[PDB]
Design a binder for this molecule. Sequence first.
Ligand SMILES: CCCCCCCCCCCCO[C@@H]1O[C@H](CO)[C@@H](O[C@H]2O[C@H](CO)[C@@H](O)[C@H](O)[C@H]2O)[C@H](O)[C@H]1O
Ligand SMILES: CCCCCCCCCCCCO[C@@H]1O[C@H](CO)[C@@H](O[C@H]2O[C@H](CO)[C@@H](O)[C@H](O)[C@H]2O)[C@H](O)[C@H]1O
Ligand SMILES: CCCCCCCCCCCCO[C@@H]1O[C@H](CO)[C@@H](O[C@H]2O[C@H](CO)[C@@H](O)[C@H](O)[C@H]2O)[C@H](O)[C@H]1O
Ligand SMILES: CCCCCCCCCCCCO[C@@H]1O[C@H](CO)[C@@H](O[C@H]2O[C@H](CO)[C@@H](O)[C@H](O)[C@H]2O)[C@H](O)[C@H]1O
Lengths: 55, 101, 102, 61, 378, 87, 189, 85, 101, 77, 167
Amino acid sequence: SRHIELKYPEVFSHGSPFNVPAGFYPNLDHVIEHYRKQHLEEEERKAKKLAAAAA
Amino acid sequence: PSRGLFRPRPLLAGAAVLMLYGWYKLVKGIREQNELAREKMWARIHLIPLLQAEEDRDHVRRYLADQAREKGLLGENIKVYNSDRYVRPTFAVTPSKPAQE
Amino acid sequence: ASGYGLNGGPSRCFPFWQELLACYVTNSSEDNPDGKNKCIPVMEDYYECLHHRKEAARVRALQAAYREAEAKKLQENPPTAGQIRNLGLLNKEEDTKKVHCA
Amino acid sequence: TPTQTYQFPSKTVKTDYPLIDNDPHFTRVIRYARPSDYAHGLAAAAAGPAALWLMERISPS
Amino acid sequence: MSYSQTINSLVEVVLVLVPSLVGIAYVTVGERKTMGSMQRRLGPNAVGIYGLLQAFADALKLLLKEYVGPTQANLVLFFLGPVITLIFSLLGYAVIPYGPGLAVNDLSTGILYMLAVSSLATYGILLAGWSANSKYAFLGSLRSTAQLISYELVLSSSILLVIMLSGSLSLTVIVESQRAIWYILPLLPVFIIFFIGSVAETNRAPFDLAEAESELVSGFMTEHAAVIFVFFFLAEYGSIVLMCILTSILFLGGYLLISLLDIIYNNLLSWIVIGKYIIFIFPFWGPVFIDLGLYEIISYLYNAPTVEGSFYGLSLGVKTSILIFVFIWTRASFPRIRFDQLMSFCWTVLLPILFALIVLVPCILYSFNIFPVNISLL
Amino acid sequence: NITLILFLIGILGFVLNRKNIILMLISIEIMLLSITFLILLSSLNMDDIIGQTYAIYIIVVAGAESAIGLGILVAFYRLRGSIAIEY
Amino acid sequence: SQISLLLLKEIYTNGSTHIMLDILSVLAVISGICVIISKNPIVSVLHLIGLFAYVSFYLILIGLNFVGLSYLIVYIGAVSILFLFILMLINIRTSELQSNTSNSIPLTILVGIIISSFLFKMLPYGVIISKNDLFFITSKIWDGALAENNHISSIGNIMYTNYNVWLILASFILLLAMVGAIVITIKPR
Amino acid sequence: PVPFETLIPYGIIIAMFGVTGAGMAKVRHMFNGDKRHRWSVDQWDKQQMERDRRLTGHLRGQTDNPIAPPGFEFNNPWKVXXXXX
Amino acid sequence: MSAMSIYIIFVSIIAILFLAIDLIFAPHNPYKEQSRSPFNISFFIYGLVFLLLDLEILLLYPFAVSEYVNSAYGLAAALIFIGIITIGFVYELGHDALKVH
Amino acid sequence: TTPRFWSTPLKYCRWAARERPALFFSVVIGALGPVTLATVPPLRRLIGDVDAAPIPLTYPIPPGPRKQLKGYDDDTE
Amino acid sequence: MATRKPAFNQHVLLDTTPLPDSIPKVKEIGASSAPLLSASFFIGARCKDYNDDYMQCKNENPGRGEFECLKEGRRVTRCARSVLKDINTHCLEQFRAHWQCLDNNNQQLWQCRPAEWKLNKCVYENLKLEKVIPDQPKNSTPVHLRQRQIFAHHAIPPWERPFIPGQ
Ligand SMILES: CCCCCCCCCCCCO[C@@H]1O[C@H](CO)[C@@H](O[C@H]2O[C@H](CO)[C@@H](O)[C@H](O)[C@H]2O)[C@H](O)[C@H]1O
Ligand SMILES: CCCCCCCCCCCCO[C@@H]1O[C@H](CO)[C@@H](O[C@H]2O[C@H](CO)[C@@H](O)[C@H](O)[C@H]2O)[C@H](O)[C@H]1O
Ligand SMILES: CCCCCCCCCCCCO[C@@H]1O[C@H](CO)[C@@H](O[C@H]2O[C@H](CO)[C@@H](O)[C@H](O)[C@H]2O)[C@H](O)[C@H]1O
Ligand SMILES: CCCCCCCCCCCCO[C@@H]1O[C@H](CO)[C@@H](O[C@H]2O[C@H](CO)[C@@H](O)[C@H](O)[C@H]2O)[C@H](O)[C@H]1O
């Protein structure tokens, strides 16, 4: 592997919630969509795995 | 010559009731302090946008002056960050000497 | 990179770190090896936020040109500090004009 | 529909069955437990003291 | 600001230090005068008109006394050791508020400043008994050092219970929080544990047996290292006064004084603009207070900065004095505890209770929604 | 630059020590102070409170090794009667 | 027309002097050598008590009040006291702890040069930031000042929640130093 | 009876604490411009007082003019340091 | 200058003056004119248990000035930290490690 | 003489309350902390004593799209 | 410049260079700290929408909001300037009485309730503007409308009554 997958992707949710200046935190909706795709693909892969082999 | 002033039963009862009264007065006070804090925060929130706006024009002013001071001195502007974000200055150019005073 | 600063938070360089983590996760995978190359500039911006070496280098140069430029031009009358402590005050309009040289 | 069904970045784990919760509440874990879980838990529980008793009878302390 | 900061700083430093030094010198006269009333005798009444110069003569007598310090391979321990003991003794005063924020330093971590100065104090006892030329006497200095470190934990664990109610380590904020109630009432056990710890920390009777047995084994060939130094005595009495002021800051009202204005407002209801000031009470009448002569002067004299500051100092002064009395009364009331017995009291009686209260108090604070805010308010 | 100087001092404490096993206890602590001071000064330079937390835990572990070390030194002294190396 | 950039001396919000840091660093170094050269282990520990206070003051003088006070409460208040106890009680003969330091003097030049010449490059720019000279500029913010916390309050905000695993592992380290130190030293019952 | 002569030292201590608090509040009142001093101050309060010196010249000066004077957009202080960072 | 600095100097100066009276005025004379025994383990234990409990109580001070935010989750963790340290105290109470009884 | 807790637990609790009072009531006060956390809040909400909302510690950004304001523009200077 | 609090600051750097002509200009607010806190609730009663647009705008542009949100900042200073002008035109006597009180009370609102109550009645009657602290508890009297203030240095006289908007 030349790619590292974060063991803890929840670091994107880190950050103090106090004394936050406006425009300090970057927009991470595209990060959220990458991790949403990944969850949906594993759900579907497993669904194909245990539904196309249980019939 | 036993006296009730030092008998354990009146003392524990007296000490107990004092602690409950003080614990009633602590409960009410901290509840008032926490509501005074709510009004202090909302008071600073309604002022934060006017105060930040006057700061923001000052940051735009000095940055545009520093960008010009460079173009007139070094012939161009040296890019520090590859991003277009405004980063608040760490170092500044300073006159060689302070005002006489 | 923790996201918590000395005054109740957040940390000054935390935006660059999240911008760097976002770039790596969303452009680099096992399919494309060179996706991480779009991260090279973003990492420099984060190494620069923490250490400020390139900014120091710009200022040392710009400051040397500024001092060598204001050390040779003719000076009419430098404003005293007391004059520049009355700048923008409600009753010292004469001193504000001198500071502004307008 | 709140319009943000997936709102937080989460770790996907390669497992064999569909994920229900990455972090269930304690009350739900007890509620969804099968009666086999109760036998298995009690069987293990008694195994500790019973090992110490059997180990006492055979090699006495 | 109006005038130079350096002048401001000097005026505040002299206004706090010089009146505190004259006070530490009358605590010594007061100990003797109090012990004598309780012991059916008199205190000092001869050096001075009412014995009020007794401290001055005793302090001056020591200064002019020859010192027999060995000075053998030590010219920095003898002449620079004890001097810094007195610097440490006066360092805690700079965080004392004589009014809201009226301190040399208004420090947010004021409590952790005082804990640091207490830990430094242990050295003076350990170094003072280092010059003791005796096997058992040297061990007594270690035993006194072990009494200080143990009762410091009692003092620091107890302060942590006030910080939980206050939310801050600023002595000003700690007192201002007590406008709701003095901390002695809701933290009654914690107060009586703090006072006992403070006497043991000061190494005063009934907790001084460790350093007391030292004078018994000197023999006929040795000497002590406190034969002429007023330094250690000034440090001792200064520590007692500072402990009493801290006890009054944390549990009594600090500088907070019961306010009559609130009591008279509730009772009075017949407000009159003609200056009569009729009262709707059973012992009331028609007062004849002069608007031009008395009420105008009284009202202005109430809000003058000097007057309000004077009654805040007098409040903190009365409460420190009451606690100084309890120190002297305690010394005149009990025998001495053996070192082993005091160590059991600290470690097997007062620390377990404090740790149990360390659990309980935040649990109650959460249960009644009474965690305070930790931002700058009050 | 102060943090590196003190790290040398603790290291040179081991360079110049043939007999003191007490001074090796002292030189370990000087090295811990230099490393904590470095983390603390770099923490103020990056606006990061997590460096202050890591410094705090290094102070706790440092005291705990002092307790574990001086206790072992007491166990050694009870049977040997000297803390001196026969060099 | 006249210089747009103007430099003035602050009057009532003028902070502290950088000089105090060069004084404290020089004092910290001087006492540092005196630790490793002193014949008596007692004097070395006293010079160590001196060093711990110079660093504590440097930290308080640069705004790290709670950690500097914590250093003063723990190192001078408790760690060094345990060092005085053991030292003032063990029988120490000072002649048996003295070694020929001159034999070791050549290796001191060698080790000092090599270690310093490597570690220095490793440090970040901001530790070695201190003729035109750079100055550090600072300005004010309002949204990030609404409810500013002292550092202890900020450490507290994250110490018992986000990074609570460190507290759990340290509590077990202290627990081990308690049980283990008593087991190796005391006579049971 | 009351032994007032033993109470005399206690009055001196109370009077000493009184004169410290009496005089300290007076000099801080004149230091702050014949106005009461500020106490539990934070970054906000300190910056609010710096802006009071921007409008009036005094850290405790006050004015309720909705329009800032000319030159106010230039006197915003940016503190310069040599070592801290 | 700062009040803290002027205060420390003044305390330092007073100490010098009291010292000077002794050197200037008090009389002076030029003439300024080996065993082994085991030490009690108790002395070690007093500093040992102090050092560990002092650190643990120190680690609790940040909780007291951050309780409004720590709240229930913070309370729980701080109680788990209190319970572990208490169990160690019950061990020194159980073995009379302080050797006081 | 002294009882055994496992053999007679209630008679031990009397002996410890009488013979080891500082220790016994430390364990008791300690246990009252977990009791108060499990009883008072349910009783508080039974009688209507609600918890206060958290106070604001960051500027309270409004959720949703911006409101597209009109007024107070450059022409109103 | 950097938001770090300074530790060894001895000098101030000013810059007389003005903003470029292209940026539309604004007149900055000239009220001090204490007048702003007296009118802080009145400004948030009227300027809340504009104050919220500005913060929402800067949020929508991360790292680029000082620029890119100038027009909105100019709208917040004009709206706040309109409230300060109105208090001066109508509530000047009570307004000064309030913030000069806060001047000698550590700028603490609970210390100056009687002055605020009289200023609240003037503003509400002249500008219809009311002070609302959001999310206050419902089982108790609002802290700002309470006859007794525990943490007040001076007792509130019984005849001084809290202003309720409509009674
Ligand atoms: C800055 C001013 C002070 C500088 C230092 C001046 C000297 C300070 C030491 C003296 C202060 C009083 O100190 C204390 O006085 C009393 C005298 O009543 C002594 O007490 C002594 O006399 C009484 C007489 O009743 C005996 O019961 C007691 O057994 C005995 O010890 C104490 O031993 C001493 O510790
Ligand atoms: C939680 C605490 C927070 C507040 C901390 C305040 C600390 C103030 C203490 C600084 C003074 C030094 O500490 C103090 O020094 C003197 C002398 O060294 C000691 O006094 C000791 O020596 C004197 C004279 O030699 C003896 O009369 C006395 O019997 C003996 O106790 C005190 O026991 C100690 O309390
Ligand atoms: C701490 C701040 C710096 C120090 C400030 C104060 C410095 C004071 C220095 C001068 C001190 C003079 O003090 C004086 O010294 C001399 C010389 O030792 C003493 O003289 C004594 O010893 C000499 C030794 O030759 C004898 O001959 C002489 O008979 C005897 O009296 C005096 O008794 C003493 O009173
Ligand atoms: C939140 C606070 C919680 C407080 C918890 C209190 C701790 C309870 C458990 C520890 C106490 C029980 O543990 C018990 O300790 C006592 C006192 O040393 C021991 O006591 C016995 O042994 C020691 C050592 O030989 C003797 O000095 C002592 O005279 C003897 O009675 C018991 O052998 C031990 O079983």
